[PDB]
Write an enzyme that holds these catalytic residues in place. Structure first.
Site, mmCIF file in Angstrom:
data_model
loop_
_atom_site.group_PDB
_atom_site.id
_atom_site.type_symbol
_atom_site.label_atom_id
_atom_site.label_comp_id
_atom_site.label_asym_id
_atom_site.label_seq_id
_atom_site.Cartn_x
_atom_site.Cartn_y
_atom_site.Cartn_z
ATOM 1 N N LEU A 12 0.963 -1.419 -0.005
ATOM 2 C CA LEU A 12 0.168 0.034 -0.054
ATOM 3 C C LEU A 12 0.775 1.357 0.221
ATOM 4 C CD1 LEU A 12 -2.656 -1.010 2.727
ATOM 5 C CD2 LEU A 12 -2.953 -0.744 0.108
ATOM 6 N N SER A 14 5.069 3.006 1.467
ATOM 7 C CA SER A 14 6.366 2.864 2.093
ATOM 8 C C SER A 14 7.200 4.425 2.209
ATOM 9 C CB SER A 14 7.283 1.813 1.738
ATOM 10 O OG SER A 14 8.247 2.228 0.575
ATOM 11 N N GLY A 16 8.834 6.769 5.800
ATOM 12 C CA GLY A 16 9.380 6.935 7.277
ATOM 13 C C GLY A 16 8.833 6.065 8.191
ATOM 14 N N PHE A 17 7.489 5.580 7.705
ATOM 15 C CA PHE A 17 6.532 4.917 8.670
ATOM 16 C C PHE A 17 7.029 3.379 8.582
ATOM 17 C CE2 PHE A 17 4.543 6.268 4.957
ATOM 18 C CZ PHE A 17 3.695 5.033 4.101
ATOM 19 N N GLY A 18 7.927 2.890 7.474
ATOM 20 C CA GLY A 18 8.074 1.488 7.123
ATOM 21 C C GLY A 18 7.479 1.112 5.796
ATOM 22 N N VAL A 20 4.125 -1.049 4.423
ATOM 23 C CA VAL A 20 2.618 -1.328 4.802
ATOM 24 C C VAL A 20 2.144 -2.043 3.672
ATOM 25 C CG1 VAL A 20 0.385 -0.618 5.469
ATOM 26 C CG2 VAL A 20 2.461 0.799 6.236
ATOM 27 N N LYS A 35 2.045 -3.585 8.684
ATOM 28 C CA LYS A 35 3.160 -2.625 8.615
ATOM 29 C C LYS A 35 4.355 -3.149 9.433
ATOM 30 C CE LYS A 35 3.951 2.047 10.353
ATOM 31 N NZ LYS A 35 3.575 3.042 11.195
ATOM 32 N N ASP A 96 -6.360 9.048 2.173
ATOM 33 C CA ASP A 96 -5.672 9.981 3.056
ATOM 34 C C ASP A 96 -6.169 11.389 2.615
ATOM 35 O OD1 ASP A 96 -3.459 11.185 1.719
ATOM 36 O OD2 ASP A 96 -2.534 9.344 1.670
ATOM 37 N N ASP A 135 2.599 14.503 15.047
ATOM 38 C CA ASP A 135 2.726 14.758 13.541
ATOM 39 C C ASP A 135 1.487 14.815 12.646
ATOM 40 O OD1 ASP A 135 4.381 14.786 11.053
ATOM 41 O OD2 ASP A 135 4.436 12.659 10.949
#
Length: 274
Positions: A12, A14, A16-18, A20, A35, A96, A135
């Site tokens: 889905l 990628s 700074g969050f990893g 997913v 994630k 989003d 954030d």
């Protein structure tokens, strides 16, 4: 257990969050987001009520998961030799807020009111749970398109809520307050209100108000779209240069512009075409 519990779909996203992945729980066909966070890429660590060493992201997520649907909930997590895997809920269909604004431009005030109100309720829930997101921005807000419900994501830059000064900040810069730019210091609640001011401007203008450090410090807000006087007032108040001059969450929600909010389902029927 292990990784027999989920069927792994497509990637889905990628950053700074990893990384997913779309997923499905085989126990009951529930949609989930999977994630993956690499161990060697996390700086902030904490411990769970059980007393285990997990990424701060997991600590925070556990604290805000339950009853409220204003935050994407953590359903389970797993540890691997080089990473942690987080099983999050996955509403469908979904978009989003960043992508939503990019596509439709500046939002009508009725819609921004409903969305902003929901973000406020979510942030309050977090703060009641002892959690500071740090954030808050359009990219970290998911819209459940069929229900008209907003959901907060990515607690990877968050912290336990406290009343004393914060001297660290790994959140998005352009959503960061003047006190962080000038002194590398801020308090949780007032910094959160600053980010809400940036977010509200973004919803009603289609873009964030400040690009550079100098603009954040000057604090002068220019409106690029037609925005009511009441909305401009609320935004300018949230973006007060002095932290103590910003409104509390209660003052925001009692503001004249925030009254008569639409319900989530109404919002979806009128604006998301449900």
């Amino acid at each position: 257990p292990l990784e027999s519990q989920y069927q792994v779909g497509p990637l889905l996203g990628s950053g700074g969050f990893g990384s997913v992945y779309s997923g499905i729980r085989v126990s009951d066909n529930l949609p989930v987001a999977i994630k993956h966070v690499e161990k060697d890429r996390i700086s902030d660590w904490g411990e769970l009520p059980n007393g285990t060493r997990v990424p701060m992201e997991v600590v925070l997520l556990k604290k805000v998961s339950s009853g409220f649907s204003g935050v994407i909930r953590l359903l389970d997590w797993f540890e691997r030799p080089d990473s942690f895997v987080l099983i999050l809920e996955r509403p469908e269909p979904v978009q989003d807020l960043f992508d939503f604004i990019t596509e439709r431009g500046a939002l009508q005030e009725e819609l921004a009111r409903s969305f902003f109100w929901q973000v406020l309720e979510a942030v309050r829930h977090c703060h009641n749970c002892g959690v500071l997101h740090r954030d808050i921005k359009d990219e970290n807000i998911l819209i459940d398109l069929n229900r008209g419900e907003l959901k907060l994501i990515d607690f990877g830059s968050g912290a336990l809520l406290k009343d004393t000064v914060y001297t660290d900040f790994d959140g998005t810069r352009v959503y960061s307050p003047p006190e962080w730019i000038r002194y590398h210091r801020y308090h949780g609640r007032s910094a959160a209100v600053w980010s809400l001011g940036i977010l509200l401007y973004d919803m009603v203008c289609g873009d964030i108000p400040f690009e550079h450090d100098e603009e954040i410090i000057r604090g002068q807000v220019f409106f690029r779209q037609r925005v009511s006087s009441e909305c401009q007032h609320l935004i300018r108040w949230c973006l007060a240069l002095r932290p103590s001059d910003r409104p509390t969450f209660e003052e925001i929600q009692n503001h004249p512009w925030m009254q008569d909010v639409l319900l989530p389902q109404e919002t979806a029927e009128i604006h998301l075409h449900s």
